[PDB]
């Protein structure tokens, strides 16, 4: 994973996201959704999803939430006050903690001012405390600003490492983007049916065709402009649409 003071930032983009494999995996110790309850994720579409990743203590997972305070949310990773995404977290004691202490997971414990939301700060300047210019030298009136979790496998829960992923769905002003997977039943034939072909909504009997579209045309129209043929997206075969009987 990535440190807590330099979190990662993956920009998930156009694709088919299935938050159900996440939601029901039962391996997550914390799955909170804020802008939107979890079950309705596989039924919405946004412009971008960002995923941030890092590793913290066990009992600092309560500062990854909109409107908190503490050494993590103050200056390591700050969530805006109208967050929209979801926060996922699971214990990882066996992977990240090693006998003798894993001193490779640091965090920032001194900063001039709390972070703006989603702001990031990887500098390593000596936190000058005393009015006396530090001059880049340690000692008194000057602290190094990074400390390290010394994780060890015999730590009580709440001191064992937890891995955290923060999904943030954003909606700029584009034309569209990633959404949840769609569905489909079994295209029936020779029965007055109520059909939807990726947008085309209609009613009628469907029948095997013998016309030949050009290999970019979806549906065919008549003179007087009524849909009378379609192409099945999955199998790519042309089917005529006749109305069902009235009189």
């Amino acid at each position, epitope marked *: 994973f990535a440190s807590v003071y330099a979190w990662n930032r993956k920009r998930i983009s156009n694709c088919v996201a299935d938050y159900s494999v996440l939601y029901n995996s039962a391996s997550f110790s914390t799955f909170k959704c804020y802008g939107v309850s979890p079950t309705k994720l596989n039924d919405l579409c946004f412009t971008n999803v960002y995923a941030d990743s890092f590793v913290i203590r066990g009992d600092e997972v309560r500062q990854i939430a909109p409107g908190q305070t503490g050494k993590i949310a103050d200056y390591n990773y700050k969530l805006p006050d109208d967050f929209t995404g979801c926060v996922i977290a699971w214990n990882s004691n066996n992977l990240d903690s090693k006998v003798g202490g894993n001193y490779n997971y640091l965090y920032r414990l*001194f900063r001039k*001012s*709390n972070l703006k939301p989603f702001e990031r700060d990887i500098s390593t300047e000596i936190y000058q405390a*005393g009015s006396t210019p530090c001059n880049g030298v340690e000692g008194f*009136n000057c602290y190094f600003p990074l400390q390290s979790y*010394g994780f*060890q496998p*015999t*730590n009580g829960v709440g*001191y064992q490492p937890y891995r955290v992923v923060v999904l943030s769905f954003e909606l700029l002003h584009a034309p569209a983007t990633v959404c949840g997977p769609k569905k489909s039943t079994n295209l029936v034939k020779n029965k007055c049916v109520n059909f939807n072909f990726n947008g085309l909504t209609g009613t009628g009997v469907l029948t095997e065709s013998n016309k030949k579209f050009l290999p970019f045309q979806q549906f065919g129209r008549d003179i007087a402009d009524t849909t009378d043929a379609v192409r099945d997206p999955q199998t790519l075969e042309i089917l005529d649409i006749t109305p069902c009987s009235f009189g």
Partner: antibody
Amino acid sequence: EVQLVESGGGLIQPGGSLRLSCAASGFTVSSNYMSWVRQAPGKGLEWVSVIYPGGSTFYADSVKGRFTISRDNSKNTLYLQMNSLRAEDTAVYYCARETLAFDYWGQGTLVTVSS
Amino acid sequence: DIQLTQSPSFLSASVGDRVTITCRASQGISSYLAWYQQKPGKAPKLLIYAASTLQSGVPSRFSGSGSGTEFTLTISSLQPEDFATYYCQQLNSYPPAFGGGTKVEIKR
């Protein structure tokens, strides 16, 4: 180097109040973790409150609410305005500059008798 | 669940000797705490850092021994001038738990 001195202790009754001034004799109380440590006489210590370099409170368990900490950087003073003392705090108060551990923490008293 | 640290108090010794004080930790803590010297009627002074890296401005008589739990301090070659109590703490976590304190007597 740093020689923190505090003032403001005395005697009062319940529902009273009192401001304590951890006078930062010494430098830069604007950017340091500071805290209040309390002990009743004949007893072990106890922790009260804490300010962050950036502003946060996190009060203790029993003194949750009814108790307020602040700083003043231009005056180099920490301010502890309390009120409604259950008189059950009659104690010897310390203010210490947490520097990755603690140390550097003066002394100062108080009593909250009902007379 | 908070940690409750314990100590075998009321020590008694003579000068120039070895004495050893342990500090229980009734939960899985890591290895970051600290010892203090509390002379009577005064302010504490921390000796052992967040483990054993003794903080500066102290003599060579203290030897903090750290672990996962069951931390232990040891004074070797005593000197008549350490009449006070010694506490444990527990840095890192905000509300921290303190020890019980061990007074140490000096035989004559």
